[PDB]
Curated annotation (Swiss-Prot):
Name of this protein: Sodium-dependent noradrenaline transporter
Membrane topology label: Multi-pass membrane protein
Lineage: Eukaryota, Metazoa, Chordata, Craniata, Vertebrata
Protein source organism: Homo sapiens
Record topology, Cytoplasmic segments: 63-81, 189-191, 267-272, 361-375, 425-454, 502-549
Residues binding dopamine 1: 21, 91, 251
């Protein structure tokens, strides 16, 4: 039997916590400003209701209806079972560096427990004479940038991706602690991992409100707020704004990676999935908008304090460089540093728990031995993640982290989600999915949702896929250029998950017995309906099914 959530509130908190993560607080705030201002909101909202909510709701419906993980849920059409393996591997890839992004915040929180913060000004061992303090004197030479790039990452010792050095004894301890906490928050199941979400998905909102209350009443935050909401429709007539909105919507709503299906597998049949999807999606967008409102309030204050136009202060390490230098100037710097970094720790842990849960359930459902000895399989997966993340904490840790960030979660998963949409709308049948959703609650999906899932979501996602490959810029870090074998390895990593779909397609084709027609029918019909193959009642071969909306 499935563990099953103990409360709809716990399930909603888990899903909303997985949705809102560091991206929602670090990307959208300045993505709304990279454009002309305001012209990004319209595409953001439009793409939300057109593809981000429909695809999110479709993913949630599959898990609840079929009660399976990320790979086993493709029993409805085994040809695409490779999609589950691809998404599982991509989740395992992303975790490697997401844990390090959490470890940095842990280190910052530990370093924040002093009356005098270590990033106030120069004079420490890790600060070069070339430093320049704005208060001590009338652009990586600022005290905060120097702290981040020498006292945390120790980049000065590194020289490139080919020269990574050895792991740092401090980040080693930090990553060990965070990984141990993650393992102890998942070693039992949803009975335990659902309890810790009550705090990890609620602390960020309390911290955000506390920070907004102060930020609104600041000497120069009004300028930042008006700049954040500067209405301007001239930029809407471009293509970069639409591409940015599409990619941001896809990569926050969370649809795909294989964590929404995992969570929805633990729900009951009489749960209102159509309402839960709308709740989660609306909360995500509202949190992003308020997060931008809060984020630019402090950038405006810093701009006013420095007496420089906001374009100058406008800017992975943005939250590790901008704010640490901003909080120091405020009253109660020690009071606010701890809170701000605890918020980042909550965001990161809350996302990582969901990712690891998705991988764990996806593999356990496939393998009953692991489903039984989960207490050992979780340790195995966590230790593999720790060993592979050991590389992303060396002296040149940021280089490898950037490579993984731009190659793992990219076209590799963008194609997987397109495969899931295709295999759900065309092969399985949008009418069949609507019938299943009706069997779940009682009211069929609206014609608008039906028209979305079949034509709009696949076209949208294919558009993003084709855009994110032709416009692939060469891999660079600020000013350092990567060697050719670095890009070769990045492409290999990205393609390792892409190749998993066709390889399994051919594997199933060869394994299945019979003639070509029999093999094709068996590979598309669900296991329970396989008996119809002998009777020759395959709906995929009828034009009516293909032309059914
Ligand atoms: C909600 N934002 C997405 C969360 C997060 O999902 C994770 C994180 C770690 C391991 C596994 C997964 C699926 C993610 C982060 C950055 C790029 C893509 C996904
Ligand atoms: Cl977003």
């Amino acid at each position: 039997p499935r563990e099953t959530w103990g409360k709809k509130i716990d399930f909603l908190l888990s899903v909303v916590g997985f949705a809102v993560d560091l991206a929602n607080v670090w990307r959208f705030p300045y993505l709304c400003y990279k454009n002309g201002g305001g012209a990004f909101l319209i595409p953001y909202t439009l793409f939300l209701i057109i593809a981000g909510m429909p695809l999110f709701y479709m993913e949630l419906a599959l898990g609840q209806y079929n009660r399976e993980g990320a790979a086993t849920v493709w029993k409805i059409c085994p040809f695409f079972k490779g999609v589950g393996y691809a998404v599982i591997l991509i989740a395992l890839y992303v975790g490697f560096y997401y844990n390090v992004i959490i470890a940095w915040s842990l280190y910052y929180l530990f370093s924040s427990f002093t009356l005098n913060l270590p990033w106030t000004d120069c004079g420490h061992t890790w600060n070069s004479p070339n430093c320049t303090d704005p208060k001590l004197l009338n652009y990586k030479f600022t005290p905060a940038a120097e702290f981040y790039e020498r006292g945390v990452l120790h980049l000065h010792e590194s020289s490139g991706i080919h020269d990574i050095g050895l792991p740092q004894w401090q980040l080693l301890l930090c990553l060990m602690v965070v990984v141990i906490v993650l393992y102890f928050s998942l070693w039992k199941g949803v009975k335990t991992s659902g309890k810790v979400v009550w705090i990890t998905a609620t602390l960020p909102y309390f911290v955000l409100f506390v920070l907004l209350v102060h930020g609104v009443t600041l000497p120069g935050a009004s300028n930042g707020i008006n700049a954040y909401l500067h209405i301007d429709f001239y930029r809407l007539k471009e293509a970069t704004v639409w591409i940015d909105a599409a990619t941001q919507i896809f990569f926050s709503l969370g649809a795909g990676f294989g964590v929404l299906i995992a969570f929805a597998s633990y729900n009951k049949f009489d749960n209102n999935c159509y309402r839960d999807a709308l709740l989660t999606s609306s909360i995500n967008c509202i949190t992003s908008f308020v997060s931008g409102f809060a984020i630019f309030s402090i950038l405006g204050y810093m701009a006013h304090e420095h007496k420089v136009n906001i374009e100058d202060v406008a800017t992975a390490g943005l939250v590790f460089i901008l704010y640490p230098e901003a909080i120091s100037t405020l009253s109660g710097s020690t009071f606010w540093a701890v809170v701000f970094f605890v918020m980042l720790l909550a965001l990161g842990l809350d996302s990582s728990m969901g990712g690891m849960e998705a991988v764990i359930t996806g593999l356990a459902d496939d393998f009953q031995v692991l489903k039984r000895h989960r207490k050992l399989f979780t340790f195995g997966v966590t230790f593999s993640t720790f060993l592979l993340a050991l590389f992303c904490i060396t002296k040149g840790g940021i280089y490898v982290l950037t490579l993984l960030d731009t190659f793992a979660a990219g076209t590799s998963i963008l194609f997987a989600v397109l495969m899931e949409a295709i295999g759900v709308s065309w092969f399985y049948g949008v009418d069949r999915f609507s019938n299943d959703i009706q069997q779940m609650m009682g009211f069929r999906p609206g014609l608008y949702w039906r028209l979305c899932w079949k034509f709009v979501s696949p076209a949208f996602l294919l558009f993003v896929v084709v855009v994110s490959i032709i416009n692939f810029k060469p891999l660079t870090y600020d000013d350092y250029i990567f060697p050719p074998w670095a890009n070769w390895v990045g492409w290999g990593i990205a393609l390792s998950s892409m190749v998993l779909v066709p390889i399994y397609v051919i594997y199933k084709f060869l394994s299945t017995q019979g003639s070509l027609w029999e093999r094709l029918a068996y590979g598309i019909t669900p296991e329970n309906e396989h008996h119809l193959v002998a009777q020759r009642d395959i709906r995929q071969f009828q034009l009516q099914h293909w032309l059914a909306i």
